[PDB]
Design a protein around this ligand. Sequence first.
Ligand SMILES: CCCCCCCCCCCCCCCCCC(=O)OC[C@H](COP(=O)([O-])OCC(O)COP(=O)([O-])OC[C@@H](COC(=O)CCCCCCCCCCCCCCCCC)OC(=O)CCCCCCCCCCCCCCCCC)OC(=O)CCCCCCCCCCCCCCCCC
Ligand SMILES: CCCCCCCCCCCCCCCCCC(=O)OC[C@H](COP(=O)([O-])OCC(O)COP(=O)([O-])OC[C@@H](COC(=O)CCCCCCCCCCCCCCCCC)OC(=O)CCCCCCCCCCCCCCCCC)OC(=O)CCCCCCCCCCCCCCCCC
Ligand SMILES: CCCCCCCCCCCCCCCCCC(=O)OC[C@H](COP(=O)([O-])OCC(O)COP(=O)([O-])OC[C@@H](COC(=O)CCCCCCCCCCCCCCCCC)OC(=O)CCCCCCCCCCCCCCCCC)OC(=O)CCCCCCCCCCCCCCCCC
Ligand SMILES: CCCCCCCCCCCCCCCCCC(=O)OC[C@H](COP(=O)([O-])OCC(O)COP(=O)([O-])OC[C@@H](COC(=O)CCCCCCCCCCCCCCCCC)OC(=O)CCCCCCCCCCCCCCCCC)OC(=O)CCCCCCCCCCCCCCCCC
Ligand SMILES: CCCCCCCCCCCCCCCCCC(=O)OC[C@H](COP(=O)([O-])OCC(O)COP(=O)([O-])OC[C@@H](COC(=O)CCCCCCCCCCCCCCCCC)OC(=O)CCCCCCCCCCCCCCCCC)OC(=O)CCCCCCCCCCCCCCCCC
Ligand SMILES: CCCCCCCCCCCCCCCCCC(=O)OC[C@H](COP(=O)([O-])OCC[N+](C)(C)C)OC(=O)CCCCCCCCCCCCCCCCC
Lengths: 329, 50, 186, 173, 98, 41, 37, 49, 175, 209, 54
Amino acid sequence: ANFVIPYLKPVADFWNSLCIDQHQDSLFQFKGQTGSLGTDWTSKYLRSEQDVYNHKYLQYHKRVHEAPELTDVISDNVYRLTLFAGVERVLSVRQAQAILKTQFAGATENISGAFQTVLNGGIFRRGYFRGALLNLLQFCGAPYQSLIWSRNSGITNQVIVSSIFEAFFYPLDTVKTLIYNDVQGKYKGAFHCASQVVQNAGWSRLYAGIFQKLIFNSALIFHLNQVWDGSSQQWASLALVAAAYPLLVLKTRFQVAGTPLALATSNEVLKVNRKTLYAGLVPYLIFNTLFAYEFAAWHSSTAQERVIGGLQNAMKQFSSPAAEQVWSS
Amino acid sequence: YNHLVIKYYQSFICNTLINKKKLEFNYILSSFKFIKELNNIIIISLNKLF
Amino acid sequence: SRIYWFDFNGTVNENLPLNYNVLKICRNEINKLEKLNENNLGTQKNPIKLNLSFEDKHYNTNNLVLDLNSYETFNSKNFISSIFDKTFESLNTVLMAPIYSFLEFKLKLSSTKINTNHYYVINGKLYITYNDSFKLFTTINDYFNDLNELSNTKLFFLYRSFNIYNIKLNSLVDFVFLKLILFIHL
Amino acid sequence: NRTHDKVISQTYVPAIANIAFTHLSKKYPQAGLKVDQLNTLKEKTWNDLGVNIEHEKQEILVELSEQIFVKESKLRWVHEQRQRLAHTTYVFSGLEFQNVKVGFFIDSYNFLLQELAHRSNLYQSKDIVGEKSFHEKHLEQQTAPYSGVKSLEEPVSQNKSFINSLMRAIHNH
Amino acid sequence: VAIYATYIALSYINNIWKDYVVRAQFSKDKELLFVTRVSPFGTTEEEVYEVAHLEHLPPSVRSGVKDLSAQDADGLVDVTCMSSQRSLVFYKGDQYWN
Amino acid sequence: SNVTGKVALATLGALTGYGAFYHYNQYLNLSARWQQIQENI
Amino acid sequence: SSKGFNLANAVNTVKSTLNAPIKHIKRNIEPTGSNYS
Amino acid sequence: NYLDQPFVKVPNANPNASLNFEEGEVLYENTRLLEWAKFWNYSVVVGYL
Amino acid sequence: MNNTFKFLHQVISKLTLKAQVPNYGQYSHSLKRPINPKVVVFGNSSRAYELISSQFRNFNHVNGLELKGQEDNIQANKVAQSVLSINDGFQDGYYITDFPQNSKQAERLDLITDGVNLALYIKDPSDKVTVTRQQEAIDYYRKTGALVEFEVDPRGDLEEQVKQLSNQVLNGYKH
Amino acid sequence: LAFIKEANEMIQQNTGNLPWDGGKKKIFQGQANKYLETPYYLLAALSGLGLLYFLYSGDAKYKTLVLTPVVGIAAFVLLRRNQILNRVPTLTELFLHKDGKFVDAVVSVNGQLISKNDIPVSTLKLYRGDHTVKVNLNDFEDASAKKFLAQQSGQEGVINVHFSKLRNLAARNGQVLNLGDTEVVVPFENQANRIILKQIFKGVEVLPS
Amino acid sequence: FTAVSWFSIYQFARKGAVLPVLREYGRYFGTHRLFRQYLHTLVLPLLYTEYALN
Ligand SMILES: CCCCCCCCCCCCCCCCCC(=O)OC[C@H](COP(=O)([O-])OCC(O)COP(=O)([O-])OC[C@@H](COC(=O)CCCCCCCCCCCCCCCCC)OC(=O)CCCCCCCCCCCCCCCCC)OC(=O)CCCCCCCCCCCCCCCCC
Ligand SMILES: CCCCCCCCCCCCCCCCCC(=O)OC[C@H](COP(=O)([O-])OCC(O)COP(=O)([O-])OC[C@@H](COC(=O)CCCCCCCCCCCCCCCCC)OC(=O)CCCCCCCCCCCCCCCCC)OC(=O)CCCCCCCCCCCCCCCCC
Ligand SMILES: CCCCCCCCCCCCCCCCCC(=O)OC[C@H](COP(=O)([O-])OCC(O)COP(=O)([O-])OC[C@@H](COC(=O)CCCCCCCCCCCCCCCCC)OC(=O)CCCCCCCCCCCCCCCCC)OC(=O)CCCCCCCCCCCCCCCCC
Ligand SMILES: CCCCCCCCCCCCCCCCCC(=O)OC[C@H](COP(=O)([O-])OCC(O)COP(=O)([O-])OC[C@@H](COC(=O)CCCCCCCCCCCCCCCCC)OC(=O)CCCCCCCCCCCCCCCCC)OC(=O)CCCCCCCCCCCCCCCCC
Ligand SMILES: CCCCCCCCCCCCCCCCCC(=O)OC[C@H](COP(=O)([O-])OCC(O)COP(=O)([O-])OC[C@@H](COC(=O)CCCCCCCCCCCCCCCCC)OC(=O)CCCCCCCCCCCCCCCCC)OC(=O)CCCCCCCCCCCCCCCCC
Ligand SMILES: CCCCCCCCCCCCCCCCCC(=O)OC[C@H](COP(=O)([O-])OCC[N+](C)(C)C)OC(=O)CCCCCCCCCCCCCCCCC
């Protein structure tokens, strides 16, 4: 009561908040009336039952008709960044595995080998979560800045704005790629990795693969809009990004080339065996399909109609199935 | 005492290597005065107390 | 082009398997004996004569000028002006990637593994093509075992090449425990 | 007063004492340091013998590393000696053996030698092959090639059919 | 119930794992056998046995020989310490044997 | 650590430079909106 | 681009997993030298 | 009182001086049992909890 | 060192050893083989040749008998250059025969090549030249602890001897 | 193929069998040890400021009053120890001239490369044991420091200190080499040509080429 | 069922194991056994489904 419960209460309270409706609990905490009907527990429960869908609509409306918020965007993409952060690294390792030394370090040239190589260092800074903060920072960069400057905009404008910001923040992406593929702990951190690159090669070394990253980004944005709209042509766009996938693979190899982490140089990367261009294509598509970015600010009119229509259909459940049709209401 | 000797030994090696002829006393006596005074006053206080 | 005979004037010990370099020389000479035509050389009565020195049989190669832990240097090739060519070539590779896969699949349909021959009999012993030389062949199981060992060596090379002297933590643990025991003795 | 605990191997203890006494005898000829007196010398302190082991500690370590050969280590002799020398000097730099008995110095050096040998063997018997781990078996299984269908590769007119060609390409790629 | 249920579970789990042998080392004169066994939390625990006491005993029922794990090439060998009334279990696989 | 300092300083300047541009644009838009609100009131 | 999953390998592993506890089950239920009459 | 048997001495608490406890050579070694024991023991505890 | 602290010391050491060689407990069997296995073989019997050929299928032969007559320094240097490289076939294992013939050559080779990973001696009763030629080398490798002895009976089982020899050399390998 | 080339280069470097790189041949390759000092300095400053704030405010606990001085002292001691370790002259590379009588070396001091040339092989000497370092107290310009050193040493103005007391923080990770008039630390973890390295350390001169 | 059977047939065929069902080669067009096993696996369950439903 004086040495355990005070420290254990926050844990239980946090546990309950996740497992209980905060809005519904807040309504029930206030009991009585001030002169207006509908404050009783029965009426509050009925309201709270529909408040789940109302709050979802309000949150969706805020993300579209109000300035984007970093916390809201991160919350929507929490799984892609919080729990499955290491999935990005293994995908990066698989893409660059063609010109890496992993195959000589108890690993195979497949997604299973890439997973083992990442997990051989554990789960923390040298393992699964290596580069996770850089992934979070990169997400807080161009993907979030682009939303601010392209809220409620067309596909073409979104691609242009995203391309501009990705170029602006590109050096961060190169550093993250080097950290992901740094399997021997050569680099002690992002600043250390950047310092080594600048000291050995020029500042231009950080912008390797930019023009092949921009083109792939444009294809990804087009695919993202198609799936958000829900049109039948989403599968056709999914093929388009799959066809453009080797652009991403080349980008990763160029970033990872010209450094002790790789066995090849920039010139040799271009003339790499063509049978490994589609390295990790299926894992990449699966990960994106399950964890596609939930950028509601870029949703078009059709996507907004789809979401509202879905909420409205759910809202219809609050009628009595056996309601009598009376001549007089 | 050991730290001062090592610092003096290191400074002597560096100055001979670089041909400076001047010892970096600013580094050798990094905190000698503070440490010596702190120990001395503590010992004096303990002797007076006990 | 399967049976050939080589004669060494005591320069090669046949009581033990031939070296990789020796086999490479044999393959390099057979490839000439076939493509360049043949004067009936390579039979038991008219074998191929070779005088192999210690350097040829043992020394691997030359041109060991690779610089370990090095970075490619930019800002000298005018990356700003030269990036256009790389981007165009990369776009060409991506566009042609599906086409190359389709072409390769067609080649597989019209091609068979048995079409090419890789077995050569040398000095009454069977050998199979290996990278750029020959490899002794005695049984299918033995060949698969050799491939497994080769794959194992390639796979675990980096793990076996660990740092012997990276024992900072181990020394610290030993020092702490002994010092504690030293205090007990004192 | 005597427990059921395995004692550290004493194979190299006589050699360590012999080397240490010989070097110390080069500087203290009248110290009476002999291998035959190890059972009794180990009970005395260096102060009683009038020997300042601190000054000669580094020389003893260098001579021990160069002289002693350990066959239980998984590393070659040159690497084993270098690692042993680096390990012992670091550990003994912060240890003062002057005020303790000779046996502690000898036992301490023997303990370091054995631990280095065990660490060289990854804390496993050098004479036991052992069983491959899950990763080793998994990698070996994956490393194995695929035989495919030999019937399709058999040279026959029927194998020239487009359908048979398609099956051969799909299954023997 | 909570205190004794936990105690019984942990104590009996240890007894089940006690028979199996993790490591076995002879003495210099091959007069004693030092055996490392599983501890309650899965760590190493040391014990000492005499080679003379150790003995491989046949089953009391003579029809149960075919049911012994030793029938399999990769089975388990049950060696009994006749002084301490303890059992030592060794894998038959030669990989684990010197 | 001169290279590291330059890289860190360059990164701070670039991020700070973007921050100034973002706030300046936001300042203009807010000023225009505030003027329109005052006229409407 | 090494090949990954193979059903035949998976089936073999499943067989090994199911056969792993057979030796221990036999030892537990087998008779012992003692005859507690 | 119980240790003071009338006709036979109880064994000495310390091992006989004849025995030498110097380590020899390893006969049997199955280190993976420790990992198996830890896995099973923790699994049952979590399941029991 | 101390009975009470042995358990704690062993546990801490095992945890820390992972830093030097990660996942050593999972890849312990693989690590028994060195990166560049250099083997010195003593034995000139017909059975010994068969065992050598079977055990060293993927290794490269180095005939040191051709170097007889030259000075030890040159012989050691030539052998080191032979066994300090990897061919295009990725065969990093070399086994030497008829060398070294004396301690001086043996020590010189070890210094140049940082020691030989293995020194295999196949004691065949039907061999009478190996002892007369390379007795000094055998003694040196016995002193340095790199010598592995595997007695072979000519009338034994070839398969069993190969299996035992493979296990012993794998155990006897050193980094 | 690329890995094989790198693996061969790694093997050559480890064995120290490099060829003649022009006018001089590299026969030694070592690296120094770097320790963290800024984190300890920041931690010590934070503890010092925190202790001052607690005294000024008076709202601290007994627990933190006990802990803060210990953390500050521990950080301060580590900072001094790391600074001494970092500033240890450590031999990084050593080259031998064609004639075999002259040696060039580059040394690292707190990450700073210093190149020394024209070092006769006859002057090189590796200290197997603990040498003695001479300290001249007359050089010190501080009366208090001079008095303290004399009292501790118990000797004249020139005091000889055995290296055993100093190897804890001076050469704990290596030996001591005499590069003519100066002395440098030779780490154990290094790649070098043992045949040539031993002779030059002993003072013997190798044959030309 | 068709997807699982097709996956199983391909995986074992890759390893060199083919179920000894159906003639190895066709009587008229010489189609290989693997091709007909895929055809039978695709069509037979569909016919059974239609027969079962009717
Ligand atoms: C959760 C509640 C709160 C939520 C808040 C809302 C969320 C959003 C908040 C965002 C804002 C946060 C506050 C500000 C943070 C600022 C950070 C910062 O600045 O860091 C910089 C970052 C720091 O440098 P660094 O430390 O060396 O690099 C990072 C290391 O790699 C290390 O990175 P890593 O990825 O390898 O890390 C692995 C990861 C391993 O561990 C994990 O990943 C664990 C994950 C577990 C699962 C997650 C479960 C949910 C979360 C649990 C939270 C529990 C509490 C944790 C407590 C942590 C301690 C505070 O952790 C580590 O090991 C980190 C190492 C420790 C040192 C560094 C970090 C210190 C701690 C700071 C933490 C801040 C996080 C706040 C947000 C919350 C995140 C959760 O540096 C850079 O980004 C440098 C980039 C340079 C790029 C190249 C530049 C080139 C030149 C450019 C030129 C441009 C001009 C060109 C002109 C061209 C012409 C036009
Ligand atoms: C529940 C079970 C599964 C759960 C998974 C775990 C989930 C946990 C939660 C999430 C976190 C984990 C995230 C994922 C982790 C990674 C998982 C993993 O290991 O997966 C990889 C693993 C393979 O990895 P691996 O073993 O390392 O790869 C082997 C080699 O490395 C080869 O790999 P590579 O990287 O080197 O790739 C080279 C590429 C090389 O190939 C090429 O690139 C070929 C290129 C050909 C070019 C020809 C050009 C001809 C000319 C053009 C003609 C057309 C255009 C003409 C245009 C004209 C007008 C303009 O190879 C391939 O294409 C073959 C890749 C494997 C194909 C797998 C197919 C799975 C199908 C599943 C069943 C069917 C769907 C059922 C749907 C309904 C289900 C209820 O994948 C699988 O075995 C399957 C995974 C599960 C499949 C999920 C279903 C797909 C979902 C997304 C797509 C939806 C369909 C869209 C189209 C249709 C719409 C109607
Ligand atoms: C019906 C409608 C369905 C519609 C959907 C249909 C979709 C179909 C898709 C296509 C699927 C094709 C089939 C094959 C697919 C295979 C998968 C594949 O392609 O993978 C490629 C690759 C293949 O592996 P490989 O190494 O290349 O080669 C495999 C060997 O050849 C293989 O040989 P091996 O020797 O290695 O064998 C492996 C395994 C082969 O067998 C299998 O693995 C098959 C397993 C089948 C069952 C699966 C059920 C669960 C499925 C997942 C459910 C969730 C999916 C969600 C989907 C997304 C939904 C949005 O062998 C065994 O059987 C081992 C024995 C153990 C088996 C399991 C035992 C279960 C016992 C249960 C009873 C327990 C006792 C209860 C009673 C006691 C009281 C409690 O696999 C992977 O690498 C998979 C990667 C998956 C990663 C997932 C994400 C991980 C994220 C980690 C996060 C960590 C965070 C930590 C945080 C820490 C913070 C502190
Ligand atoms: C792990 C906890 C272990 C607790 C042991 C308890 C012993 C009970 C014995 C029973 C026999 C009868 C004795 C009389 C009745 C006892 C009544 C009683 O229990 O009163 C407790 C008394 C009740 O306080 P309260 O009425 O709630 O007042 C609240 C104020 O905040 C309170 O603030 P305040 O400043 O006014 O506090 C007054 C301070 C005034 O102090 C005194 O009571 C008198 C002076 C005693 C000397 C120690 C003072 C604390 C200095 C720091 C630790 C130094 C290391 C040596 C510790 C020796 C054991 C005390 O009294 C204490 O709290 C003394 C204990 C504090 C120790 C904190 C560090 C925990 C680890 C300790 C063991 C370390 C291993 C040592 C190995 C052997 C070494 C030879 O204080 C406690 O609550 C103590 C327990 C607090 C546990 C939570 C700590 C914070 C959260 C975790 C932080 C972890 C990281 C930082 C610490 C890391 C380790 C250094
Ligand atoms: C309603 C339609 C539904 C259609 C469903 C789709 C599947 C069936 C049609 C598929 C067609 C496209 C397939 C791809 C073609 C690719 C090209 C290619 O290379 O061929 C692939 C492959 C043949 O390639 P191959 O390399 O030459 O392989 C030959 C191997 O010998 C072949 O060996 P095997 O390994 O295939 O095994 C033999 C075959 C078993 O086949 C037999 O040989 C069994 C024969 C049983 C005869 C039962 C007595 C019938 C009494 C008279 C019936 C009159 C019609 C009554 C109409 C009632 C109203 C519906 O399979 C089995 O034994 C296992 C299956 C178990 C039996 C289930 C059969 C169900 C059939 C359902 C459809 C029936 C359509 C009839 C159309 C009208 C016929 C007049 O095609 C097939 O396997 C398809 C076979 C379809 C049935 C053929 C029946 C022939 C005997 C006719 C007797 C009566 C007329 C005789 C006239 C004589 C001249 C004057
Ligand atoms: C291995 C260790 C090696 C180093 C050895 C170090 C030797 C010196 C040890 C010094 C110990 C000091 C203990 C201080 C205890 C806390 C005092 C305190 O809280 O005062 C804050 C007070 C009040 O400050 P405040 O007004 O800000 O109040 C803050 C309130 N608390 C403490 C709850 C946060 O400040 C003072 O003015 C104190 C001045 C005196 C400080 C010394 C007091 C010593 C009391 C214990 C010993 C008593 C004598 C014992 C018998 C000996 C013979 C007489």
